Amino acid sequence: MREIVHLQAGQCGNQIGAKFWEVISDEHGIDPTGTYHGDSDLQLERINVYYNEATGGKYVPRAVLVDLEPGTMDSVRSGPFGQIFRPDNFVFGQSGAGNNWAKGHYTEGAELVDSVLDVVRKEAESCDCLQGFQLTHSLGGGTGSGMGTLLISKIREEYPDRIMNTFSVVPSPKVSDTVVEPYNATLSVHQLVENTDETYCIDNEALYDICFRTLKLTTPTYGDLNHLVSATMSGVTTCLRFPGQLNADLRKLAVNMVPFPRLHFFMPGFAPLTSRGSQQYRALTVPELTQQMFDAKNMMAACDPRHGRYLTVAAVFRGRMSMKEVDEQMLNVQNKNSSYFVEWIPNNVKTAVCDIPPRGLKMSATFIGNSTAIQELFKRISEQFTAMFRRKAFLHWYTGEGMDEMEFTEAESNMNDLVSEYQQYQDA
Amino acid sequence: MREIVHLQAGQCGNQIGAKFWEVISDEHGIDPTGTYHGDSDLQLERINVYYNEATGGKYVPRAVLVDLEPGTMDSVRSGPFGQIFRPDNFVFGQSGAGNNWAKGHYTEGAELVDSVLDVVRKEAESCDCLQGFQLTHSLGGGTGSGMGTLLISKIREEYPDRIMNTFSVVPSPKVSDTVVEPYNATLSVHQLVENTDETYCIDNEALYDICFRTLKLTTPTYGDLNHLVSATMSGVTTCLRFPGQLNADLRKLAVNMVPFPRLHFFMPGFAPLTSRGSQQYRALTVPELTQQMFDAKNMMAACDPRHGRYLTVAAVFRGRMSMKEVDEQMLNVQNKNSSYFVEWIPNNVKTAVCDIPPRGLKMSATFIGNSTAIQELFKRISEQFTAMFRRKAFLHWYTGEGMDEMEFTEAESNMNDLVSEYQQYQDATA
Amino acid sequence: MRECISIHVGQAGVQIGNACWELYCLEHGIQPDGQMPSDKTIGGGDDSFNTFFSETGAGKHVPRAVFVDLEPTVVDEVRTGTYRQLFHPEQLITGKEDAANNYARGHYTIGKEIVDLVLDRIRKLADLCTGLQGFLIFHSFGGGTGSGFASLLMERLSVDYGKKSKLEFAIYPAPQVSTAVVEPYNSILTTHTTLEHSDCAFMVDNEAIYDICRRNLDIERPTYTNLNRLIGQIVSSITASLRFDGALNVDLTEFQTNLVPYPRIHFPLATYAPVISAEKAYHEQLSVAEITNACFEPANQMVKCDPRHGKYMACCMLYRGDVVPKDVNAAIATIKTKRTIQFVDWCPTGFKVGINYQPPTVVPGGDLAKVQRAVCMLSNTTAIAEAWARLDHKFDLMYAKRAFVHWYVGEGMEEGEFSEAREDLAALEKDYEEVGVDSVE
Amino acid sequence: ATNYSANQYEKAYLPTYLQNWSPARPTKEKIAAHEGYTQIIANDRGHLLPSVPRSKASPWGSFMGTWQMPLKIPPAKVTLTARTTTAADNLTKWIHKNPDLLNACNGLRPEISGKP
Amino acid sequence: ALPFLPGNSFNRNIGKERFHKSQHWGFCNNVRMLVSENKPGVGGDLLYG
Amino acid sequence: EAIERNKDIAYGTKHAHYDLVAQMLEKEEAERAYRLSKRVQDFREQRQQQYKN
Amino acid sequence: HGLPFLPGSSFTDSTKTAFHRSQTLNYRNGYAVVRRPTMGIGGD
Ligand SMILES: Nc1nc2c(ncn2[C@@H]2O[C@H](COP(=O)(O)OP(=O)(O)OP(=O)(O)O)[C@@H](O)[C@H]2O)c(=O)[nH]1
Ligand SMILES: Nc1nc2c(ncn2[C@@H]2O[C@H](COP(=O)(O)OP(=O)(O)O)[C@@H](O)[C@H]2O)c(=O)[nH]1
Ligand SMILES: Nc1nc2c(ncn2[C@@H]2O[C@H](COP(=O)(O)OP(=O)(O)O)[C@@H](O)[C@H]2O)c(=O)[nH]1
Ligand SMILES: [Mg+2]
């Protein structure tokens, strides 16, 4: 019908996927055993987008959990919502890459590329009219950034027309936890530009920014961070699963967000974030929802859009509202902050309404936006990659894998020609 | 009516068919004593296909247990269904072959052939209209690969028109359990290529694979292997015994599977091989059945059909279903994978249904496929035989029995004739 | 499954193995006999020990180690000790006569006798093994066995296992105090032959640990046991991510890769924090900022080199306990914003952060207090080139007169290999200088 | 002798997946057929005929013990990323110094990656 | 306690010792013959009936 | 149609119950194997005490 | 006490110990075996 097969790669991928598969189970009212315990009829009306039917009133996620190290699976499989995954879909080898992008991509990722392509193929053909796959990984890893590209390059050949998302994670400059982070990210964005329909650049440091200042959580676990990201991936396909006054989908956003195929990097957003005591003094209304969103403090990216031009904007709203206000509020921001919006594209924003609110909450919204201020990230990563690469440092690890050295030069050049082309659209 | 005499040769033959007669006893509701205790009336309607009536309301399988050694027959009698066989069918001698094809075929089995022919012809006469016989043996031994073929060659001369099936066990490349294995294998397959209507190639290393992959058994003994083979043998003649919406027999499957008389080698598989982790997360529905049917991992041979072209494909179904899904899902595999099916045969798949499923199960099927990937077995045996036959290795055992050296030349030239003729059918233009 | 196999060589190797394995047994729950203090066999339970221990058919666990020493008594103490039934008897291998502070004897005459037996034992241990992460090899550069036989074991282990990690904990010679006269000869001839055959190296001197244990833990009179407790704690924090879950786990290959920029240089310096007594920790609040600031103090390194006399090129960092990623990031920011800590030009981000949940266990009779959080550090810095320079100075002024070379030449090693090894270290120091130079115009 | 291919099941017999954690035997992935039958190459008791060609090298394999091995074994892992030209040359020279270690069965075949 | 199908079978031989075999069958009076109807099975244990 | 869906639910329940029986039987089998190993070990302990003394 | 599952709405224990990771996924012979996950993180 319209089905999504959720990919997975690496320890970053497994911990976001564990939380993400937790939260949609709550919207659809699915208990840890797998059965259905919801009370509203429409909670089970389009579940087959993500779940697959099994006997006994049981549903299984359409996931492909992949990692070079089994150790991440064992932590996943012992969670509350860990036994809901079918065991055959787990794909895992014996040895990892050790934050080396080349080991993931060329030598060890080759042995696990046969089985993963089988697990998706069985799930790809199970669904009649598959809408498109979806992957989450980190660019600072060895498996998610590593072979995690080798799936993407392969399945584009098999299934070109289907839509590939990626809630990939981009390293942050101020705090980094991998020394060879520049080389993996430089060699992965070069994969991302050629083979991807749409990308969401989520940075963990901005998640630390949000939790510290807005929610003011004293002890933000990595579970809290994944909840921030899992809530985003629900809000992009909520129109797929539930009806609305003006409906949408993945392709409706992607078509209406990408003016030229080279630009598919978008800054997500999620509106109703308040502290424990802030909800006392708040007012659940649409102008406040749009006010809390466009503030740069709410973004989970590492770039302020006030420095660039908002190319295009998507806003998807959750909850039964009156769209006199949503059109008037969307025009108010468009006309006030005129300098930060591009000129050759009028009516830059796309809107959609999904009537069913998230569970326990009255109103919500999410946002996808393309800016020229993101290139403040690619430009920022490049010199970190370049300064390493003048001295040929950390290169014997990569060169010992059999790759030549011109891959670094071209991946630098694609990275530099992208920001050059991206820079031109700012000054147009 | 339509009867089958189940032949038997060697330790592999006796141990495989010991399980086989049990699983069809359970299908027909027969106790170890031999009496009828079933409840459905169709459980005894076509029982005469295999069983023979005895006085006092008892049934005797129409089997002929043959082996040059009396060894395994003690274990056969000491099994759970040990005394169901009538004792006069047990035919045996003094000294075995010792994995020597020559002794079984020429110097020792030639004394044991006459007695087996007496029992076989006695069973052959008793039935009115016998469809054919059925032999289970291994190609890596001395008796089933040896005199087991001499039974084949003699009986074909006596009864030309009857169908002869052979659920042979071929040796495996990766681990072998006999060092003169390619000597007996390359010289037994020459007997099959002249005198056999069908052969099913069952390889153990595939059987060891399937138990771990699709069932996740920590300790799969040879009993679990033998039950896995015996489920296939039931699945080909279930449509023969039990009524169906669209029926088939052995001969109906025979006509549609051999395009030319030289090609009678297949690779079978069994559909609802479901693991003890996966029953919880599963939906028993016919696309899931044909999904696991055509996955190459489910084959029980040492050849990958993804490397060759499927000539003809058989799907014999068990259980009550809806045939629209049966026709549609077969069509989906037909067209989504175009390059693995030959182009000069449109609609390379034959389908048949049997209304009654296997006992204790709802839905099932078995698959018979004639592929050009089976030629990867013959060349492998040819090289392993040639490299052993270059230096006259292990040969003094065989030529000391009186055989000349020249049969090895013609057995390998006929064998390499088959691989060349198989290859030309793979690379053929429509 | 996770796996590290231990190849302790020498007297230092055996005593370090004693401390490490006592800590592992107490941490996992294993008795000194080997069986759990229960039956606990109605099902397969917690198997986290599988990276160090091996199950048997009797419900016993056998360590994945091979103690080797070329003299009997150090291993006989193990064979008669408290843990005398923990170790399978064929694992602990001994020899009749030792090299006696002679790399030549430990490399050519006596070392080559017990090469085959130890290699066969290693082969059986690896045969038992499914997912082998690495070989942990601990020895000293001074002693004859721990230099010569350990070098030859590495050299043949390269042939036997092409790609497996061979991690190297080393007792580096102390700059002033010493237990030997002929130790610089073994020190120069060891690194020269392990330079292309070793993957990483965790060299520590006993002197700096003596200063640490005096200054912080208030033990005025330390002992090798008191030092071995700290070394066992270091190895524990290294392999904790393999043994237990974490917010961000880290294998061996990860911190091998994010620590060594160039093929010849592989010499990190380790650091543990905090190491304070119970009285000292009664009054002191401990947090991520305090522990990561103490990790950078020159008066806390267990090598006698001040990194302010150099520049870091990498830092692997391993948090353990009730640590929080937000405070980790705050601490990383506050250490990056300091000029007293330099970094090379080519490395803007030189950090590799791992996180583990389980706080470090305490062994009875120890010195440390029970602490909720801790941190380990492996810093690859260029401030160790002064140590190599001092070593070359001592070797040079010994070698001018051909002193003690009559011992070495007889056993089967020529004198030209001395000069070749000295020239190799001469090249290595200049390599360190080229790395330490900055390309700023 | 010859290790053939399990095709679909080759990953079940991959050398690391059989607990053999050393570099291992080659696995022949392809096979070829020969028309006709095979000539005799050897006499009785496996003596090669005078007319046939006969290969060189010892009929005892090639196994080198502790005392047979060279006293300076070069490593398998060679990564010529930042080395100078002469250093690269001399390490290649050390690698190629003893071909007997390369031809030995239990000897090493190194991997040499990159250019100075 | 399982329906008889592939996979649903467990070897009862775990725990059993003395896997002796009997001498059923044999040639007496130059005749192929099941010698003796009263011999035990594997383990020296009685058959059924 | 309601009868058909009840039929399918019945077949599914039978399938799941047979799974649960199979798993419990394996666990009991592993317990029996462990017991046999322990009996072998205790026999060995007795003979080992004899051999030492 | 059953507050809705919203972003940043969760509490964690401050006194649980052990944190033992058990080996569910494993290899046997040349195959991959996925053990049924009893005995969660830390034994409980
Ligand atoms: N840190 C630490 N160093 C030790 C220990 N035992 C010995 N050493 C050091 O090891 C060096 C000499 O090597 P040893 O381990 O004593 O003896 P060996 O390695 O067996 O060499 P041989 O005595 O010649 O057989 C000395 O300089 C000691 O400082 C120990 O338990 N802890
Ligand atoms: N956003 C987010 N990032 C994570 C999480 N877990 C790990 N990461 C990031 O993943 C990066 C390391 O990924 P890694 O484990 O090496 O990926 P792998 O090699 O593919 O398994 C680190 O920079 C972490 O910041 C998570 O739960 N959420
Ligand atoms: N599938 C299967 N194969 C078996 C069994 N028993 C033996 N074999 C095969 O039979 C071959 C040896 O057969 P053998 O006893 O020499 O047969 P015989 O010489 O005719 O008696 C081996 O390669 C085994 O793989 C069994 O129970 N099942
Ligand atoms: Mg000593």
Q: What would the 3-class secondary structure string for chain A be?
A: CCECCECCCHHHHHHHHHHHHHHHHHHCCECCCCCECCCCHHHHCCHHHCEEEECCCEEEECECCEECCCHHHHHHHCCHHHCCCCHHHCEECCCCCCCCHHHHHHHCCCCCHHHHHHHHHHHHHHCCCECCCEECCECCCCCCCCHHHHHHHHHHHHCCCCCCEECCECCCCCCCCCCCHHHHHHHHHHHHHHCCCCEECECHHHHHHHHHHHHCCCCCCHHHHHHHHHHHHHHHCHHHHCCCCECCCHHHHHHCCCCCCCCCEEEEEECCCCCCCHHHCCCCCHHHHHHHHHCCCCCCCCCCHHHCCEEEEEEEEECCCCHHHHHHHHHHHHHHCHHHECCCCCCCEEEEEECCCCCCCCCEEEEEEEECCCHHHHHHHHHHHHHHHHCCCCCHHHHCCCCCCHHHHHHHHHHHHHHHHHHHHHCC
Six token digits for residue C13: 């190797």
Q: Does D35 touch chain B if contact means CB atoms closer than 8 Å?
A: yes
Asked if A161 and A131 count as a contact pair (C-beta separation under 8 A), the reply is no
Contacts of A396 in chain D (CB under 8 A): 79, 81-82, 114
Six token digits for residue C73: 């008594």
Q: Which of C118, C2, C1 is nearest to C65 (CA)?
A: C118
Method in brief: cryo-EM
> What single-letter DSSP state applies at residue B36?
B
Burial class of residue C171 in the structure, from the number of CB atoms within 10 Å of its CB (0-12 exposed, 13-18 middle, 19+ buried):
buried
CA distance C184 to C141: 9
For the CA of C101, the nearest atom of ligand 1: 24
Report the run of H or E that residue B61 belongs to, with start and end: strand B58-61
Nearest CA to ligand 2 atom 10: A12
Q: Which residues of E10-38 are buried (b: 16+ CB within 10 A; e: fewer)?
A: beeeeeeeeeeebebbeeeeeebeeeeee
Nearest ligand (C-alpha, residue A139): 2
In order of A22, A351, B23, B91, B265, the CA distances from B116 in angstroms are 68, 85, 25, 7, 26
Question: CATH 1.10.287.600 in chain A, residues?
Answer: 375-425
CA distance A177 to C349: 8
- The CATH number, out of the four listed (3.40.50.150, 3.30.1330.20, 3.40.190.10, 2.30.30.40), of the domain defined by the range A265-374: 3.30.1330.20
Which CATH superfamily includes the segment(s) A3-257? Tubulin/FtsZ, GTPase domain (3.40.50.1440)
From the CA of C247, how far away is ligand 2's center (Å)?
9
E strands in B255-348: 265-270, 310-318
CA distance B16 to B8: 9
Report the run of H or E that residue B369 belongs to, with start and end: strand B364-371
- Interchain contact, C1 vs G22, CB within 8 Å: no
Angle between the N-to-C axes of helices C224-243 and C10-28, in degrees from 0 to 180, rounded to the nearest 10: 50
CA distance F34 to F39: 9
Whether ligand 2 lies within 6 angstroms of the CB of A144 is answered as yes
**Which residue carries 């399978």 as its tokens?**
C88
Whether ligand 2 lies within 6 angstroms of the CB of A358 is answered as no
Q: Which of A16, A81, A77, A5 is nearest to A228 (CA)?
A: A16
Asked if B312 and B369 count as a contact pair (C-beta separation under 8 A), the reply is yes
Confirm or deny that B226 is annotated as ligand binding.
Answer: yes
- Interchain contact, G41 vs C44, CB within 8 Å: no
ω into C274 cis (within 30 of 0): yes
Distance from CA of F34 to the nearest CA of E (A): 10
> Within a 10 A sphere around the Cβ of C417, how many other Cβ atoms?
17
Nearest CA to ligand 2 atom 6: A12
Q: Does D47 touch chain C if contact means CB atoms closer than 8 Å?
A: no
**Which residue carries 């080279």 as its tokens?**
A262
Show which residues of C are catalytic: 254
Confirm or deny that A144 is annotated as ligand binding.
Answer: yes
Dihedral of CA C122/C125/C131/C132: which sign?
A: negative
B375-425 CATH fold: Helix Hairpins (1.10.287)
* Terminal Cα-to-Cα distance of chain G (whole angstroms): 23
Question: CATH 3.30.1330.20 in chain B, residues?
Answer: 265-374
Displacement of CA C166 from its chain's centroid (Å): 11
Amino acid symbol at B131: Q
Tell me which residues have their CB within 5 A of the ion that is ligand 4.
Answer: C 11, 98, 143
CA distance B367 to B271: 8
Distance from CA of D32 to the nearest CA of A (A): 26
Instruction: Report the residue of A35, A36, A55 to disrupt the F interface, i.e. the one with the largest count of F CBs within 10 Å.
Output: A55
> What single-letter DSSP state applies at residue B321?
-
Angle between the N-to-C axes of helices C416-436 and C385-399, in degrees from 0 to 180, rounded to the nearest 10: 150
Question: CATH 3.40.50.1440 in chain A, residues?
Answer: 3-257
Instruction: Report the residue of G12, G19, G29, G44 to disrupt the C interface, i.e. the one with the largest count of C CBs within 10 Å.
Output: G19
- Interchain contact, A55 vs B283, CB within 8 Å: yes
Whether ligand 2 lies within 6 angstroms of the CB of A170 is answered as no
Whether ligand 1 lies within 6 angstroms of the CB of C18 is answered as no
Asked if A81 and A19 count as a contact pair (C-beta separation under 8 A), the reply is no
Phi, psi torsion values for B216, nearest 5 degrees: 55, 65
Distance from CA of G40 to the nearest CA of B (A): 18
CA distance A267 to A273: 17
Report the run of H or E that residue G26 belongs to, with start and end: strand G25-28
Amino acid symbol at C35: Q
What does DSSP say about strands A199-200 and A165-166: parallel, antiparallel, or unpaired?
A: unpaired
E strands in C165-233: 165-171
Q: Which of C23, A122, D82 is nearest to B292 (CA)?
A: A122
Burial class of residue C5 in the structure, from the number of CB atoms within 10 Å of its CB (0-12 exposed, 13-18 middle, 19+ buried):
buried
Amino acid symbol at C361: T
**Residue B263, SS3 per DSSP:** coil
Q: Does B276 touch chain F if contact means CB atoms closer than 8 Å?
A: yes
Which residues have a Cβ under 8 Å from the Cβ of A5 and sit 6 or more positions away?
A: A62, A63, A64, A120, A123, A124, A127, A130, A133, A134
Which residues have a Cβ under 8 Å from the Cβ of B6 and sit 6 or more positions away?
A: B17, B20, B21, B50, B61, B62, B63, B64, B133, B134, B136
Six token digits for residue C133: 């992460």
Whether ligand 3 lies within 6 angstroms of the CB of B222 is answered as yes
Q: Which residues of C309-318 are buried (b: 16+ CB within 10 A; e: fewer)?
A: ebbbbbbbbb
HSE-CB of E39 using CA atoms within 13 angstroms: 18
CA distance A15 to A71: 12
Confirm or deny that B366 is annotated as ligand binding.
Answer: no
Six token digits for residue C306: 């001040």
Instruction: Report the residue of G25, G27, G33 to disrupt the B interface, i.e. the one with the largest count of B CBs within 10 Å.
Output: G33
Q: Is B392 left (phi over 0), alpha (psi -120 to 50) or beta?
A: left
Q: Does D3 touch chain A if contact means CB atoms closer than 8 Å?
A: no
Q: What is the DSSP string of D21-78?
A: -S------------SS-----B-GGGPBPTTS----S-TT-----TTTS-SSPPPSEE
Burial class of residue C285 in the structure, from the number of CB atoms within 10 Å of its CB (0-12 exposed, 13-18 middle, 19+ buried):
exposed
Which residues have a Cβ under 8 Å from the Cβ of B246 and sit 6 or more positions away?
A: B323, B351, B352, B353
Distance from CA of F7 to the nearest CA of C (A): 37
| Alpha helices for C29-81 (secondary structure H) | 72-80
**Residue B403, SS3 per DSSP:** coil
Dihedral of CA B76/B80/B81/B82: which sign?
A: positive
Length of chain G, in residues = 44
> What single-letter DSSP state applies at residue B352?
E
Whether ligand 3 lies within 6 angstroms of the CB of B370 is answered as no
Nearest CA to ligand 1 atom 29: C179
CA distance B392 to B384: 13
In order of C148, C183, C216, C438, the CA distances from C395 in angstroms are 17, 9, 34, 30
Could you tell me which chains touch chain F, where touching means 3 or more CB pairs under 8 A? A, B, C, E
